[PDB]
């Protein structure tokens, strides 16, 4: 029963979530440019 | 109390999982970026 260590672990976890939100936005930005560039590529199967 | 502690441990496991996914998506994404330099339009 840490009493207050739980508040701190929650605060820390939220920081990890903030990080993952930033990473996810950044991955999406890069993915979106590949999609836009991919419309002009020659695809031949 | 112990249901909350267990939820915290589980949540951190879910966060670890998502960190690995992000790393893996980036690795795969980097190869498409490298290849895209040689592309015909």
């Amino acid at each position, epitope marked *: 029963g840490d009493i207050s260590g739980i508040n701190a672990s929650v605060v820390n976890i939220q920081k990890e979530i903030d990080r993952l939100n930033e990473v996810a936005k950044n991955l999406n930005e*890069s993915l979106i440019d590949l999609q836009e560039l991919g419309k002009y590529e020659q695809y031949i199967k | 109390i112990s249901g909350i502690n267990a939820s915290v441990v589980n949540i951190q496991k879910e966060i670890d999982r998502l960190n690995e996914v992000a790393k893996n998506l980036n690795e795969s994404l980097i190869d498409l970026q490298e290849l895209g330099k040689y592309e015909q339009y």
Partner: nanobody, 126 residues
Framework: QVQLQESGGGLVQAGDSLTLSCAVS????????MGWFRQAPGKEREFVAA????????YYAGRFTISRDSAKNTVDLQMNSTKPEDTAVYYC???????????????????????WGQGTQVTVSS
């Protein structure tokens, strides 16, 4: 595939303004980001400014104004009130897609660019 050609450098009196220009040749797409960097004596390549080719989003590292003309296919760097600290070789670079997967400040990292101009010397005389 793009080629970059800087122009407009040379001698400039301190306090005066100067405009550099980068002529982009080849296949430009909306995904491109053009960045201006400078290499001053004794320091590392410094990010100055960048502009996203499609949307026109601009990023700065005050005295400098970047803009792009998508009709003429140029990127311009206007240097206002030049200072002796502005003496450097200036480089135009192009990244063909967003490299934000490397971080939100990716466009400040010269390694994230794919094509480079040859560089133009600017010398501020006092």
């Amino acid at each position: 595939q793009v080629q970059l050609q800087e122009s407009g450098g040379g001698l400039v009196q301190a306090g005066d303004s100067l405009t550099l220009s980068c002529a982009v040749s080849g296949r430009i797409f909306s995904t491109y980001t053009m960045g201006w960097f400078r290499q001053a004596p004794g320091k590392e390549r410094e990010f100055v400014a960048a502009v996203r080719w499609g949307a026109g989003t601009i990023y700065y590292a005050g005295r400098f104004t970047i803009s792009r003309d998508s009709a003429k296919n140029t990127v311009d760097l206007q240097m206002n009130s030049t200072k002796p600290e502005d003496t450097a070789v200036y480089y135009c670079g192009a990244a063909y897609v967003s490299k934000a997967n490397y971080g939100s400040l990716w466009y400040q990292d010269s390694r994230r660019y794919d094509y480079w101009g040859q560089g133009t010397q600017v010398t501020v005389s006092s």
